[PDB]
């Protein structure tokens, strides 16, 4: 068991700043754990992942895709994840242009599909998975696929008729009309993806169970906005490794290499 907990944050080029910025986390953790903390910020994901693998980071904060890579190479466990919009998970919604006569995923056969950014989960990878798993529809092959830039652009492109359907974040679609981006009488929801996970905090499994248990309780109980605002989080809530299978499965289905 390390005398001082090595708590790594997201990788960053300005390590001194991000460490200073997150002093409220250091102070919150020392007081609540009764243990000294050393904050760590790595130049890239490979450094972080390998340093944890070899016992030189104790707790670490990852992106979900990054977490899945870290887990394949080392005995770690997630114990909390970022809460935003009331939970540590989110969905994608598929919407359809009302006038296009698309009533079901299957009807996207030979139609136009709007996606956000090639790299987005909520506006590309997730909605693409849904179409494949549910209707055996492959992008490029069984429908025409347009990448239009952002989540707002998906909603707009579907609503104004330039696509028949599109996939975006549930959360963002839910205020697209509120913000006046679209007429809500021109689109309807076809359905939702499963729940995908947010940024996990993860720890090395061979820390003592006394420490591990206490770590998890402390992080889950953080209510200090000065700590939380740096993660753009309302809270941290329990999460487990099993909550990232839906990402593993998405990798496979689409043939993604996370590096």
Author numbering: 5 to 263
Manuscript excerpt for this entry:
Here we elucidate the molecular basis of high-affinity phosphite and hypophosphite acquisition by determining the ligand-binding affinity and structure of the PBPs of phosphite and hypophosphite ABC transporters from environmental microorganisms. We over-produced and purified PBPs of three putative phosphite transporters; PtxB from the globally important marine diazotroph Trichodesmium erythraeum IMS101 (Te_PtxB), PhnD from the oceanic picocyanobacteria Prochlorococcus marinus MIT9301 (Pm_PhnD)35 and PtxB from the soil bacterium Pseudomonas stutzeri WM88 (Ps_PtxB), as well as a PBP from a putative hypophosphite transporter, HtxB, also from P. stutzeri WM88 (HtxB)18. The structures reveal that ligand specificity, measured here by thermophoresis, arises from a combination of steric considerations and the interaction between a ligand P-H hydrogen atom and an aromatic π system in the binding pocket. The structures of two distinct types of phosphite-binding protein and a hypophosphite-binding protein reveal that a P-H…π interaction ensures high-affinity binding of specific ligands, representing a universal mechanism in these PBPs for recognising ligands with a P-H bond.
In our study, numerous attempts to crystallise apo forms of Te_PtxB and Pm_PhnD were unsuccessful, but a 2.1 Å resolution structure of Pseudomonas stutuzi PtxB (Ps_PtxB) in an open conformation was determined. Analysis of the conformational change between the open and closed, phosphite-bound structure of Ps_PtxB using DynDom42 revealed that domain closure is induced by a ~60° rotation around an axis that lies between the two lobes. This is facilitated by flexible loops that form the hinge region between the lobes (residues A85-T93 and Y200-Q202), as well as residues from the extreme end of the C-terminal helix (G255-L258). Superposition of the individual lobes of Ps_PtxB in the open and closed conformations shows that lobe 2 (residues 96–196, 0.35 Å RMSD cα) adopts a very similar structure, with the conserved STS-H motif (S124, T125, S126 and H155) spatially conserved in both conformations. In contrast, lobe 1 (residues 1–84 and 202–255, 1.55 Å RMSD cα) shows some differences between the open and ligand-bound states. The positions of Y94, which hydrogen bonds to one of the phosphite oxygen atoms in the closed structure, and D16, which hydrogen bonds to and stabilises the capping tyrosine in the closed structure, move ~7 Å and ~4.5 Å (cα-cα), respectively, on ligand binding. Y94 resides on the hinge region, the conformation of which alters substantially during domain closure, whilst D16 sits on a flexible loop that latches over the binding pocket in the closed conformation. In addition, the B-factors of the core residues in lobe 2 are much lower in the closed, ligand bound, conformation compared to those in the open structure, implying lower overall flexibility when phosphite is bound to the protein.
